[PDB]
Ligand binder design. Structure first.
Ligand SMILES: *C(=O)[C@@H]([C@@H]1N=C(C(=O)O)[C@H](S[C@@H]2CN[C@H](C(=O)N(C)C)C2)[C@@H]1C)[C@@H](C)O
Length: 267
């Protein structure tokens, strides 16, 4: 980290808030860390871990992913771009999971959170893989309040990265479910201006974004596969002191670039 600690501080000072980064080179175990153990709001980024928890359950329930789910108009909350198109038909659990990951579909996320036993059930899943930091406490959209100092609905960049590595590259999911989780992340549509903007076009990447809409709070986490070397797992989270401070995608991309530079990944 010492290779880039000064550029990280300058970046967050220009941003006018706080930036949290953890990045892990899964080959050597080398890391880059900046505010890595501070809590930041998850915002919509909890939905990636939600889809992983669904996949974990599907290991014990072979009919889960194909199960149709029907929902009423009152389930459709703002930014439900996929589930609004299937209001009159329903969608399967797998389809809802893909929509939650790849479009950050809010109705889909709420339906899946219900299936898993709510915020505590997702928290329990994260505990089961060894993440003692993650906490989900509320539902979409109350969980995005991003109040300064409020630990509800937060994690740290380090724990996000550690859990993402276990789920995408480690043994937390069985191999078929692991590849499905990776495929959903690779198909994300909402992150082109964040970690992906720091990653060369010939490298594979999967990610999940979050944007709370207040307190300069937004984030992205990703697995990146540079060619010819082991994958990199990283998390970039931001917040800022004032409710109407705006988030910045460019700052997230810039922080990801610094993380890769610190790890010595030529990009
Ligand atoms: C999650 O953080 C919110 C929902 N998830 C996303 C996403 O792409 O991760 C969008 S936030 C994205 C950033 N700029 C736009 C915005 O903030 N809007 C539309 C208000 C779109 C979506 C809102 C969740 C809190 O709803």
């Amino acid at each position: 980290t010492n290779l880039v600690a000064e550029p990280f501080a300058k970046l967050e000072q220009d941003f006018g808030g706080s930036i949290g980064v953890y990045a892990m080179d899964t080959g050597s175990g080398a890391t880059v860390s900046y505010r890595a153990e501070e809590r930041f709001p998850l915002c919509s980024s909890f939905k990636g871990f939600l889809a992983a928890a669904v996949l974990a359950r599907s290991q014990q329930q072979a009919d889960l992913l194909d199960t149709p789910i029907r929902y009423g108009k009152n389930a459709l909350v703002p930014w439900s771009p996929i589930s609004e198109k299937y209001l009159t038909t329903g969608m399967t659990v797998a389809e809802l999971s893909a929509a939650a990951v790849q479009y950050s579909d809010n109705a889909a996320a709420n339906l899946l959170l219900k299936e898993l036993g709510g915020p505590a059930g997702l928290t329990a899943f994260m505990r089961s893989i060894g993440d003692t930091t993650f906490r989900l406490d509320r539902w979409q959209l109350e969980l995005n309040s991003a109040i300064p100092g409020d630990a509800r609905d937060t994690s740290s960049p380090r724990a996000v990265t550690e859990s993402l590595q276990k789920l995408t590259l480690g043994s937390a999911l069985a191999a078929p479910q692991r590849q499905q989780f990776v495929d959903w992340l690779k198909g994300n549509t909402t992150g082109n201006h964040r970690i992906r903007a720091a990653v060369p076009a010939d490298w594979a990447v999967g990610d999940k974004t979050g944007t709370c809409g207040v307190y300069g709070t937004a984030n992205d986490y990703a697995v990146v596969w540079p060619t010819g070397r082991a994958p990199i797992v990283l998390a970039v989270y931001t917040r800022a002191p004032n409710k109407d401070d705006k988030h910045s995608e460019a700052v997230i991309a810039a922080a990801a670039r610094l993380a890769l530079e610190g790890l010595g990944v030529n990009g």
